[PDB]
Amino acid sequence: SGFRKMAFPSGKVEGCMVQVTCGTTTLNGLWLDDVVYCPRHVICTSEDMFNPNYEDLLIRKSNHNFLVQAGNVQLRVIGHSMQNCVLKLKVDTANPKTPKYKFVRIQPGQTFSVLACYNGSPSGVYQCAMRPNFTIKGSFLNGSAGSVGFNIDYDCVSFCYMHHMELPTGVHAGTDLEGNFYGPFVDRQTAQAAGTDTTITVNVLAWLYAAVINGDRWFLNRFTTTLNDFNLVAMKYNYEPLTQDHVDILGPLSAQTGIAVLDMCASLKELLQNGMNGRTILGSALLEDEFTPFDVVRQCSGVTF
Amino acid sequence: SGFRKMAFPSGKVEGCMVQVTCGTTTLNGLWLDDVVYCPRHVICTSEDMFNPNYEDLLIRKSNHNFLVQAGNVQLRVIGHSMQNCVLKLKVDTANPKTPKYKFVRIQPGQTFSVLACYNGSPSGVYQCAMRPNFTIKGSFLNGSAGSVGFNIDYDCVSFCYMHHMELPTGVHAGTDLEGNFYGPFVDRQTAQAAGTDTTITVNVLAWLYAAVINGDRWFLNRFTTTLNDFNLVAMKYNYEPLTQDHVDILGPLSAQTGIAVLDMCASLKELLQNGMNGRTILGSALLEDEFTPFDVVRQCSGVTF
Amino acid sequence: SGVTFQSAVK
Amino acid sequence: SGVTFQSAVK
């Protein structure tokens, strides 16, 4: 029993984290085989930030301009290139701790673990979701750029986020590991602002299933709703539309608990319209939306890595 | 910016996790140097559980009765003993991944990371606190016994919890790594129930400081309170007494934010008496009590390992 | 009503 | 008002 915000074991990723310094600017990099991946804004002086031309700033650098430190070992950079908003520093040594891995670009609403790092040293691990507006609600200070987000499947680490920057509202923006930003954001000092965010409906439903699995039924009712009618209430409360695909994804959890997806939707509609009346669900007084259906199956059934 | 439930990087502990089997009973163990630590109830058949005599059950076993698997390597047990409620299996091989470590018995209100494991394989990492009633609100299924809780300081892993069992309310009970239970619990199948729990006041205050550090001041006010008067309100709302020692521990956070401890206490008193009026703090609609003062400094200042 | 020891059956 | 790039100064 119990239900926690649960991150993947971070060990496979810890062994990949390094420090990258260029001039007076330092941040973290990701060492896989003989390549170190990091945010390209490492090559930027603060004076370069309002409208950087990175192709220009990079042609002006040499391999020796990049200091890569793996613990207490300097790695020598033997080559460099830009791919989108990430730098790839080729180094003389392959990482002997390179896990089995892939790079994936996730969809909004998907969750991942973040290994927050400073000076190439891991500091903490937490879970978060890619918001519908393509920000993440992370926990990041100066120095944390280059920390990565990931999921683990068996022994394969799927990297899906590299951290770059913090927006004025205190939420976070970054790229996939091939350097493409999530959302409309650019690695320039400019006015940029997240689009208005929405609640991830399919995740809220999954978490209500998690609550049922853990013995909490107070919010259930005997009504059903139609998809169309539920989606009408969703839009009024700033919830993402629920699709037939979402319904299908929630299939396994509906099956385990015997609660039809559309019946759970009637529960959620009541919760949206009436509040919680001083009650909690899995220890929250808010409707939680950063557990995917997969997260719930993973934790209520006990899958390992 | 941001504030997350943040666990320590689990890699140093992942390399210590093994599988221990005795008869038809399996669970996890902790491999440090040439010793494997695990719950002594591994030696129990389900029939042995209402009133086990472990000294008896153990004298009846041989070293070959214990199957220890580290990944895909059988470790040979060359000796065994009981210390309190833990078994220590001496093995022919030292663990080459043994981190620098210590065993510590924590006080109620302290937090730690849990590496939840099944069949010796790490599955997930989360944070939790030792409750005032000496349970933890964990996330554990059958097979998870032997998972450990820990804190990391520089490169030193301080193990403080080994998981044993789940109480009827769905909360969790276990030992320090020397086998002494937290709380009044015993490793017998019997009626056992947690004492009534209380909210960890000093932690709630720390988290209100975290909220101020992250730019949230809506709950502050201009009043001060006396310690004695605050403690009167604490007891009425089922909060732990706040001591002068707690005040002193909150010293650094009071200093960084310029809010006197007793002034923060007046904020908390108002929140207790008036609720939140549909507002949130660091994304919670409840007063959060599983961040210690140290946790807040660690995450709002960016300490690594 | 009872405590559950959270070993597993092999 | 502005984005903060979360490198650090050496």
Per CB-CB distance under 8 Å, the chain D contacts of A185 are 3
| D/C touch flag: 3 or more CB pairs below 8 Å | no
Rg (alpha carbons) of chain A, rounded to whole number: 22
Q: Does domain A201-301 have CATH number 1.10.1840.10?
A: yes
Residues of C with CB under 8 A from a CB of B: 1-10
CB contact (8 A) between residue C6 and residue B27: yes
**B24 interfacial to chain C (CB closer than 8 Å):** yes
A193: how many CB neighbours lie within 10 A of its CB?
A: 14
Q: Which residues contact A196 (CB under 8 A, 6 or more apart)?
A: A133, A238
CA separation (Å) from A246 to A30, A105, A226, A238, A240? 34, 19, 14, 17, 11
Q: How far away is chain B from the Cα of C4, in angstroms, using its nearest Cα?
A: 5
Resolution of the experimental structure, in angstroms? 1.7
Provide CATH 1.10.1840.10 ranges for chain A: 201-301
Write a three-state SS string for chain B.
CCCCCCECCCHHHHCCEEEEEECCEEEEEEEECCEEEEEHHHHCCHHHCCCCCHHHHHHCCCHHHEEEEECCEEECEEEEEEECCEEEEEECCCCCCCCEEEECCCCCCCEEEEEEEECCEEEEEEEEECCCCCCECCCCCCCCCCCEEEEEECCEEEEEEEEEEECCCCCEEEECCCCCECCCCCCCCCCCCCCCCCECHHHHHHHHHHHHHCCCCCCCCCCCCCHHHHHHHHHHCCECCCCHHHHHHCHHHHHHHCCCHHHHHHHHHHHHHHCCCCCCECCECCCCCCCCHHHHHHHHHCCCC
User: Backbone phi, then psi, for A262, in 5-degree steps?
Assistant: -70, -25
Per CB-CB distance under 8 Å, the chain B contacts of C7 are 25-27, 39, 41-42, 44, 142-143, 145
Q: How far away is chain A from the Cα of D9, in angstroms, using its nearest Cα?
A: 5
CATH architecture of the domain with residue range B99-175: Beta Barrel (2.40)
Q: Which CATH number fits domain A14-91: 1.10.3720.10, 2.40.10.10, 2.160.10.10, 3.40.250.10?
A: 2.40.10.10
- Closest among B232, B228, B233 to B247, alpha carbons compared: B228
Answer yes or no: are the C-beta atoms of B234 and B242 closer than 8 Å: yes
- Closest among B106, B213, B204 to B149, alpha carbons compared: B106
Closest partner CB to A170 (pick from B2, B116, B171): B2
B11: how many CB neighbours lie within 10 A of its CB?
A: 24
Answer yes or no: are the C-beta atoms of B6 and A139 closer than 8 Å: yes
Provide CATH 2.40.10.10 ranges for chain B: 14-91, 99-175
Handedness of CA A128, A129, A134, A137 (dihedral sign): negative
Q: Which residue of A has its CA nearest to B11?
A: A11
Closest partner CB to B165 (pick from C1, C4, C10): C4
CB contact (8 A) between residue C8 and residue B164: no
Residue C9, burial from CB neighbour count under 10 angstroms (0-12, 13-18, 19+): exposed
Structure tokens at A301: 């059934």
Experimental method: X-ray
Distance (Å, whole) CA B264 – CA B227: 11
